């Protein structure tokens, strides 16, 4: 039964591949440093 | 004749704290530009130099010309000239107030 063994192995390979795809660590490294560079200042009527 | 003698000067300290320094470096030009007109305001105070007319009356043989000069000097007393672009400053003042209100509500948001 090579066909059934091949299908299980390929289905396993797909299932391992999907598990690897979500295996990660999300990070939030976007602080408010750019907000400190948006100092809106009024033009003075010289 | 009135309004602004050399004693008048606005609070430069609060104004200097308000401006973002080199971002509004024209204020550094504006203060020195206004300071230069203070140098002109340093000279020529309100009253001129007094002149002892009696010394020239006695020294001159005929003091009738000195009396005529003194009478014409007292008659010719010209007052201050007219303000020119005060309305333009007033118009920009109203425009500044609108920009003040617009910037205030946006900053509040």
From Swiss-Prot, chain A:
GO biological process: ATP biosynthetic process; proton transmembrane transport
Function: Mitochondrial membrane ATP synthase (F(1)F(0) ATP synthase or Complex V) produces ATP from ADP in the presence of a proton gradient across the membrane which is generated by electron transport complexes of the respiratory chain. F-type ATPases consist of two structural domains, F(1) - containing the extramembraneous catalytic core and F(0) - containing the membrane proton channel, linked together by a central stalk and a peripheral stalk. During catalysis, ATP synthesis in the catalytic domain of F(1) is coupled via a rotary mechanism of the central stalk subunits to proton translocation.
Transmembrane segments: 3-23
Localization annotation: Mitochondrion membrane
GO cellular component: mitochondrial membrane; proton-transporting ATP synthase complex
Signal peptide (residue range): none
Keyword Nucleotidyltransferase attributed: no
Organism: Artemia franciscana
The protein, known as: ATP synthase protein 8
UniProt keyword list: ATP synthesis, CF(0), Hydrogen ion transport, Ion transport, Membrane, Mitochondrion, Transmembrane, Transmembrane helix, Transport
Gene this protein is translated from: MT-ATP8
Membrane topology annotation: Single-pass membrane protein
RNA-binding keyword on record: no
Family classification: Belongs to the ATPase protein 8 family.
Subunit structure comment from the entry: F-type ATPases have 2 components, CF(1) - the catalytic core - and CF(0) - the membrane proton channel.
